Every structure is written in structure tokens, then in C-alpha cells.
């Protein structure tokens, strides 16, 4: 659809692209000192184009930003163990709380 800059919904999209960018950097870079350096740059690359008042100019970046993430996506992203996709997700789920309705079989 159309892209309306400075609208609340358009900002959240840019917020989402930011979590994709930094987490992907975190996935590849496994040293904090190296990560902050690259994480600082991405924000600069994210904040340099902060000011846009045009629809069509912004949509090209959205097209480009998706391509940047897809090619750089990690083949084994880090996931917290209890979050979905983690090593301990769904383990030992507490049983459902409900009354046993007896049936006369």
C-alpha cells in the first residue's frame, strides 16, 4: 500500500526493520566490541534517511531494506530457549485445568 511518513503505523514499520537489522548483526557477530561497532553503523544508516516527506522515495528503501535482510539472514539465528523456536519451548507444559466430566460408557 501507500507509505505515509510520520504516521504512527509507518514508524512502527521502521521500528520493525530495526529489530531485523540489529538481531541479524547480532546473529553473525559474536563479539560485543565488534557488534557495537556494526550496530552503531546500522543506526547511522537508519538515521541518515530519517527525514523523508515523499511516499515513493520511501517505498524503494522498504523494497531495498527487505532485500538487504534476506541476503544477510543468518542460517541459524540465536533464539532464547523458552521462546518459540528455542531449545526448551513447550517443554513440560503444565496440564490443562478443567473438570473431568464423567461419562457412563
Amino acid at each position: 500500500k501507500a507509505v505515509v511518513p510520520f504516521s504512527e503505523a509507518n514508524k512502527k514499520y521502521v521500528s520493525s526493520l530495526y529489530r531485523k537489522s540489529l538481531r541479524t548483526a547480532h546473529d553473525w557477530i559474536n563479539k560485543t566490541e565488534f557488534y557495537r561497532v556494526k550496530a552503531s553503523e546500522i543506526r547511522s544508516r537508519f538515521d541518515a534517511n530519517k527525514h523523508i516527506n515523499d511516499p515513493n522515495e520511501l517505498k524503494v528503501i522498504f523494497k531495498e531494506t527487505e532485500a538487504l535482510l534476506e541476503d544477510y539472514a543468518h542460517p541459524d539465528p540465536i533464539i532464547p530457549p523458552c521462546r518459540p523456536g528455542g531449545s526448551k519451548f513447550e517443554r513440560n507444559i503444565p496440564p490443562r485445568v478443567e473438570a473431568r466430566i464423567p461419562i457412563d460408557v
Binding site: 534476506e70 542460517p75 518459540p84 523456536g85 513447550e90
Partner: protein, 132 residues
């Protein structure tokens, strides 16, 4: 990217059963709320005719690379070893034996390798030590 698994049809018309584009239920966002959180499905949602092939119980689908690209990398990797094994075979670069193959006394232990008489012998004999 986000491609659907093989053999899922592009079109179907089963009379009055609803038509709907296939959706790979394994790839729904695991954080969104669902009525059936394990199957990531909401109550009374319609099913594709082959929904059994597009849910959490079907074989896992991996979409990191295209199914053709995987063949190229897979065949190349063994193809690389093929040339490494071929060139040595074609070139004969493997070393020669440093000693004669081990020989054995008593007619190559013919009798001790399950032989009865001297006519067969070579059938059951080992490397004969002709140089006692």
C-alpha cells in the same frame, strides 16, 4: 524466501467446497495469539483440501534456499571430491607398496583355509610363500 512445498496444487474445484489459497501453517508467526496455540490455528478456520500436507504434523519445510540451489551445492561438494579421487586414479599418484604382500607357508595355508586336497588349493590358498 517464503515458497510453498512441492506438489501443492495451484487450482482446485471440488464443487461447493470453498476455494482458498494454500497457507503453510508451519510458517505462521509463533507469537501471535491463536485458539489452538500448538497447531497455530484458530477455531472454525477453513482448511485447504490438502491441509494435511500444510500443517505442523506434515514434514518440516525448509525455505532458506531454493530446492534447485540445494542440489547445485550438494552435487558440487561431492563433485569436488570426485575430481580429487579421479585425478589420483587417472594420474596414479598414490604410492606403490614398500614391501611384497604378506606370504604364507604350508602352501599358503591352503589346508588351514578350508581346503581338503591339492587339486583345489588355489581356491582356498592364501598368498603362497614360494620363497622358504
Amino acid at each position: 524466501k517464503s515458497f510453498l512445498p512441492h506438489f501443492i496444487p495451484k487450482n482446485y474445484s471440488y464443487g461447493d467446497y470453498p476455494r482458498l489459497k494454500p497457507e503453510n501453517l508451519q510458517k505462521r508467526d509463533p507469537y501471535l495469539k491463536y485458539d489452538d496455540q500448538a497447531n497455530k490455528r484458530n477455531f472454525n478456520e477453513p482448511l485447504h483440501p490438502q491441509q494435511d500436507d500444510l500443517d505442523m504434523w506434515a514434514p518440516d519445510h525448509f525455505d532458506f534456499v531454493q530446492d534447485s540451489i540445494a542440489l547445485k551445492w550438494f552435487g558440487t561438494f561431492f563433485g569436488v571430491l570426485a575430481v580429487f579421487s579421479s585425478v589420483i586414479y587417472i594420474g596414479g599418484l598414490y604410492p606403490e607398496k614398500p614391501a611384497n604382500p604378506r606370504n604364507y607357508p604350508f602352501s599358503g595355508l591352503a589346508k588351514d583355509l578350508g581346503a581338503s586336497s591339492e587339486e583345489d588349493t588355489l581356491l582356498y590358498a592364501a598368498k603362497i610363500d614360494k620363497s622358504i
